[PDB]
Design a protein around this ligand. Structure first.
Ligand SMILES: Cc1ccc(-c2nnc(C)c(NCc3ccc(C)o3)n2)cc1
Ligand SMILES: [K+]
Length: 112
């Protein structure tokens, strides 16, 4: 069920290093469109994604490929691109943490 334990451990190391980057702050938790008075968020963003959801899918063995993790990350960034604009501060921070995460994933050991 899910990626093998060594792949999962590498991915969790990656996530935990990323969470500690200041650029991660806006993605630590799910966006709360009501707390933030942005009602149009769930109309534009059909699939919200955040670092907490990713981590908890990881622990649940809900990821079958490292590419799924990367895709959820990408989606996390494309959401802010779509709702705040391509050059908003939050979007650039998303891009920065996405770069850091891919960099970490480069060293992802193989299934075998
Ligand atoms: C008026 C406005 C419009 C969009 C957004 C917004 N868009 N995307 C995301 C991922 C996001 N995350 C919440 C967050 C940002 C900073 C911290 C500490 O939490 N907020 C915030 C305010
Ligand atoms: K904006």
């Amino acid at each position: 069920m899910g990626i093998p334990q060594h792949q999962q451990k590498h991915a969790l190391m990656a996530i935990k290093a990323v969470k500690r980057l200041k650029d991660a702050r806006p993605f630590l938790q799910p966006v709360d469109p009501v707390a933030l008075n942005i009602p149009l968020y769930f109309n534009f963003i059909k699939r919200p994604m955040d670092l907490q959801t990713i981590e908890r899918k990881l622990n649940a063995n809900a990821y079958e490929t490292p590419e799924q993790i990367t895709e959820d990350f990408n989606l996390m960034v494309e959401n802010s691109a779509k709702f705040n604009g391509p050059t908003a501060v939050i979007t650039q921070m998303g891009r920065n943490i996405q770069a850091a995460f891919e960099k970490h994933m480069l060293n992802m050991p193989a299934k075998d």
